[PDB]
Nucleic acid binder design. Structure first.
Length: 753
DNA sequence: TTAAGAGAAGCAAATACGTTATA
DNA sequence: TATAACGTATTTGCTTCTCTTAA
C-alpha cells in the first residue's frame, strides 16, 4: 500500500502508531482479505490499532457469521480500546442474544469508547433496569455513548431520588443518553433544587442537561446566571444558550465578549442568537475577530450575524473570508454567497461549490440552480450526490429542473438516492412520475417515499386514495403526516370529521401535529363555540397547531376589541395565523387612531403574512398619505398576501412610475393583487422597452394587473417573435392580461421555438 | 493502553411563517 | 377565493470527528 506521506503521519501520530505502521505493511495481504484500504486506515487512526488490527483477524471472521455486518465491525475495532470491545463480543454476543438484544443493539453498545465493560454492565443490570420500569430499549440508548457503563450504574442511583422530583423516566433517559451522562445526572441530583429556586423550569433543566457536557452547562448557570441577567439577558435567553453543546462555553464567552461586541454595534439579541448554537463560544470569538476584514468586503453586520448564527458558524465566517474573493471572481453575487454559508455546515457547502461548480455547469446546470442545491443544510452532500447520480437519474427519465427540485431541499442527497432505490417500485403501485417528484421534492423527501410505499395500500383501503396521498406529501406533511393519518383517522372518524377534512388538515407542513391538535382541542372549540368548518379552516394551514392554540388563548381579548368569531377565524385561517392574531391585539390600538376601522384590520390581517402587513400598515401609512393615497387605498394594497411587500413597493417605485405616466389609481390596481410588489418592479424595469415597442400605457396597466409580473416578462421575451409571425399588439395584450397570462403567451410562442 | 468526558461541526427531517402566481 | 407552489426560518435529533484528562 502506497501511503502518501500525509497518510503515514496520520497513523504515526497515534500512541503506538509507529508499531502499527510496521504491522500494516507486514501483514498487508491478510488484512486485505477482510478490510478495504479505507477500513484499515480508519482503524489505524486510533491510539493502539496494532492490537485492534490483530483483533479483527481473530474475532472478525468469527463475527461475520455470528450475525454482524462488516460496517459494524469497523466501527467497533476503530476506536480507543477497540480491541477489547471486539474481544468482548466473542465473549458475550450470546448471553445478550439470549435476552432479546439485536445485532444493531449489541453493536450500538460496543461502538464507542469503553464498549467492553459497558457490555458487561448491561449483562448485570438487565435485571435491575427490569424491575425498575426501564425498557430494554432504554438501556441501549443510555449505553450508546462513550463509557455508558458509568451512565447505567448511575441512572440506577439517581433515578429513585429524582423520580420523585418532577422528572419523567423519559427525562432521565434524555439526560443519560449522552457522552458523560453520569456527570449529567449526578450534577442534576445536586443542582435542580438550587435551580428551581432561581426560576428555572423543569423542562429547562432537562434541556440544559441533555447534551454532551451537560454537567458543565449546569454549574455555569449557577455561576454566571445572575451576572448575565444584570447585562440585559432573560432567563429564557440564558437557558437557550446553555441548552446546547458547550453552553458553559457560550455563557462564559458572552460575558468575556458581549460588552466588546455591544460597542461594535452588535445588539445583545443578535449576539445571543449567535451564542445560541453548538460552538456558540467559537462563533462569538470568530465574529469579533473577522468583523473588519468582512466589514471591508460588503458584508453588513446583520449579514455577518447570519453566517455566524448557525452550527459551526465560526467555520463559516472563515471559509467566506478566504473564498469570497474567489467566488466573486467567479460569477457569484454577495447574496448568493450568504445563502450558501448561511446554513449549518456552510463552510462545507462553500468548498463544495468550488470543488464541483464548474463540473456542474458542464452537466447542464446554470448558477441559479447550483445556489439552490447548495443553499441548504448539507449542501455539500447535495452537490456531490448530484454529480455521482447524474447519469442514473437521466436514465430513469427525470428532467433537469426535476433534479434541482429533489436536490434543492435539505437532505437532497438522500432524496436523490431514494428515487433511484424506491420509485421504479412506486410506478408499480400506480403513481405518476410528477407524482413521484412531488413526494421527493420536499424536505424529508426520502422519508416520504418510503412512507408512501409502506403505507399506501393500507391507506387506500382505509378510505383514501393515491391522488390525495400525493396531496398530503407533496404539500410538506411528509412521512409524519401519513403515519398520523393512519393511527388517528379512526379517533377522527368518531369525533365527526370527514375524509376531505382529514385530507385538508394533513395536507400541510406540520399536519401530523395538527391531526393530534384537533383531537385535543375540538371540544373546547365547540364549547365556545366554533363550528367544525372553523376548526378545519384554522387547522388546515402550515403551523396548524400554533393557530389552533392561539385562537383559544386570544379569542376573548379580540372579542373585547370589537372583533367577531368569523373575523377571528378569517385571521386564524392562513399560514402564520398565530402570528397574525397576536399582531392584531398589539397594533389594533394605534390603527384605530390612524383611521382604520375594524373590518379593515380584518382585511389586512386575513391573509398569510397578516403580522407583516399589519406592521407595514403601521410604518408607511404616514408617508403614503403625503403621496395622495386614501386610507381605503392603503387597505386594498395591503389586503392581499404579501401586503407588506406591496406597500414597500408603492413607496419605493411609486414616484419613478409617476413620471413615466402612471396615475396613482393605476399604481393601486397593479399593486392590489397577490404579487403586487413584483408587478410594480416588473413595470418599473420592463415598462420603457414595452413602450418603445408600441404598447399603450393602458396596455401595460392592463397586463400588469391581470396579468402580473410573469405575464409582463412573457410579453417582453416573446412579443417581438409573435409580431414577426404576424400577431397584433391587441392580440398579445388581450391574451397576456388575464390569470395565467404568462403561460398563455408561452403556449402561443412554442410552435416557433 | 484503555476510559471517561467535554466541546464542536455537520447532516437530515420536521415544522413554522411568509410571499408569489394561478383561475 | 382558495390554494399550489415555492422560499426560507426555527426546532429537534442524531453521528462523527478532535481534543483533554486521567489512571
Amino acid at each position: 500500500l502506497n501511503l502518501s506521506p500525509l497518510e503515514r503521519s496520520k497513523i504515526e501520530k497515534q500512541y503506538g502508531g509507529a508499531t502499527t505502521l510496521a504491522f500494516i505493511s507486514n501483514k498487508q495481504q491478510e488484512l486485505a482479505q477482510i478490510l478495504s484500504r479505507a477500513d484499515i486506515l480508519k482503524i489505524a487512526s486510533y491510539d493502539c490499532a496494532a492490537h485492534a488490527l490483530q483483533a479483527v483477524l481473530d474475532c472478525g471472521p468469527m463475527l461475520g457469521k455470528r450475525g454482524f455486518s462488516q460496517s459494524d465491525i469497523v466501527k467497533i475495532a476503530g476506536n480507543i480500546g477497540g480491541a477489547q470491545a471486539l474481544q468482548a463480543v466473542l465473549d458475550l454476543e450470546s448471553m445478550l442474544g439470549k435476552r432479546g438484544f439485536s445485532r444493531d443493539d449489541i453493536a450500538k453498545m460496543a461502538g464507542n469508547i469503553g464498549g467492553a465493560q459497558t457490555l458487561q454492565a448491561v449483562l448485570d443490570l438487565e435485571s435491575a433496569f427490569r424491575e425498575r420500569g426501564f425498557s430494554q430499549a432504554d438501556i441501549v440508548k443510555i449505553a450508546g455513548n462513550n463509557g455508558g457503563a458509568q451512565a447505567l450504574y448511575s441512572v440506577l442511583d439517581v433515578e429513585p431520588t429524582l423520580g420523585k422530583r418532577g422528572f419523567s423516566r423519559a427525562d432521565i433517559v434524555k439526560i443519560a443518553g449522552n457522552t458523560g451522562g453520569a456527570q449529567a445526572l449526578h450534577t442534576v441530583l445536586d443542582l435542580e433544587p438550587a435551580l428551581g429556586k432561581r426560576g428555572f423550569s423543569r423542562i429547562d433543566i432537562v434541556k440544559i442537561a441533555a447534551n454532551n457536557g451537560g454537567a458543565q452547562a449546569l454549574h455555569a448557570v449557577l455561576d454566571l446566571g445572575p451576572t448575565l441577567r444584570e447585562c440585559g439577558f432573560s432567563q429564557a435567553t440564558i437557558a437557550k444558550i446553555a441548552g446546547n453543546i458547550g453552553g458553559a462555553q457560550a455563557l462564559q464567552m458572552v460575558l468575556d465578549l458581549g460588552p466588546a461586541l455591544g460597542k461594535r454595534g452588535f445588539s445583545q439579541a443578535t449576539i445571543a442568537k449567535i451564542a445560541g448554537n453548538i460552538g456558540g463560544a467559537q462563533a462569538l470569538q470568530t465574529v469579533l475577530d473577522l468583523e473588519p476584514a468582512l466589514c471591508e468586503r460588503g458584508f453588513s453586520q446583520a449579514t455577518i450575524a447570519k453566517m455566524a448564527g448557525n452550527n459551526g458558524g465560526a467555520q463559516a465566517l472563515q471559509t467566506v473570508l478566504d473564498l469570497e474573493p474567489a467566488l466573486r471572481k467567479r460569477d457569484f453575487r454577495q447574496a448568493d454567497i450568504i445563502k450558501i454559508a448561511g446554513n449549518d455546515g456552510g463552510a462545507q457547502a462553500l468548498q463544495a461549490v468550488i470543488e464541483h461548480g464548474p463540473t456542474l455547469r458542464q452537466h447542464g446546470f446554470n448558477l441559479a440552480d447550483i445556489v439552490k442545491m447548495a443553499g441548504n443544510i448539507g449542501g455539500a452532500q447535495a452537490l456531490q450526490a448530484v454529480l455521482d447520480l447524474k447519469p442514473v437519474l437521466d436514465e430513469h427519465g427525470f428532467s433537469q429542473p426535476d433534479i434541482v427540485k429533489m436536490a434543492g431541499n435539505i437532505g437532497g442527497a438522500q432524496a436523490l438516492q431514494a428515487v433511484l432505490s424506491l420509485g421504479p417500485a412506486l410506478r408499480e403501485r400506480g403513481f405518476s412520475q410528477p407524482d413521484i417528484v412531488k413526494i421527493a421534492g420536499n424536505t424529508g423527501g426520502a422519508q416520504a417515499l418510503q412512507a408512501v410505499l409502506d403505507l399506501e395500500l393500507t391507506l387506500v383501503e382505509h378510505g383514501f386514495s393515491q391522488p390525495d396521498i400525493v396531496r398530503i406529501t407533496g404539500n410538506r406533511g411528509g412521512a409524519q403526516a401519513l403515519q398520523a393519518v393512519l393511527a388517528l383517522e379512526l379517533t377522527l372518524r368518531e369525533r365527526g370529521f370527514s375524509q376531505p377534512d382529514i385530507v385538508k388538515i394533513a395536507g400541510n407542513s406540520g399536519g401530523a401535529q395538527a391531526l393530534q391538535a384537533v383531537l385535543d382541542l375540538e371540544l373546547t372549540f365547540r364549547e365556545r363555540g366554533f363550528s367544525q368548518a372553523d376548526i378545519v379552516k384554522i387547522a388546515g394551514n402550515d403551523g396548524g397547531t400554533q393557530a389552533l392554540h392561539a385562537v383559544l388563548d386570544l379569542e376573548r381579548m379580540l372579542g373585547d376589541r370589537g372583533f367577531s368569531r368569523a373575523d377571528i377565524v378569517n385571521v386564524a385561517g392562513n399560514n402564520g395565523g398565530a402570528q397574525a392574531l397576536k399582531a392584531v391585539l398589539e397594533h389594533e390600538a394605534t390603527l384605530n387612531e390612524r383611521g382604520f376601522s375594524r373590518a379593515d384590520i380584518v382585511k389586512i390581517a386575513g391573509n398569510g403574512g397578516g403580522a407583516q402587513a399589519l406592521k407595514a400598515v403601521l410604518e408607511h401609512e404616514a408617508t403614503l398619505d403625503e403621496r395622495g393615497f386614501s386610507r381605503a387605498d392603503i387597505v386594498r394594497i395591503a389586503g392581499n398576501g404579501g401586503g407588506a411587500q406591496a406597500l414597500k413597493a408603492v413607496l419605493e417605485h411609486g414616484p419613478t412610475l409617476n413620471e413615466r405616466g402612471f396615475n396613482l389609481t393605476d399604481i393601486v390596481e397593479m399593486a392590489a393583487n397577490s404579487g403586487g410588489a413584483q408587478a410594480l418592479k416588473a413595470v418599473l424595469e420592463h415598462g420603457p422597452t414595452l413602450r418603445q415597442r408600441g404598447l399603450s400605457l393602458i396596455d401595460i396597466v392592463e397586463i400588469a394587473s391581470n396579468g402580473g409580473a410573469q405575464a409582463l416578462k412573457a410579453v417582453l421575451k416573446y412579443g417581438p417573435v409573435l409580431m414577426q409571425a404576424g400577431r397584433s399588439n391587441e392580440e398579445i395584450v388581450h391574451v397576456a392580461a388575464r390569470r395565467g397570462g404568462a403561460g398563455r403567451i408561452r403556449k402561443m410562442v412554442a410552435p416557433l421555438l
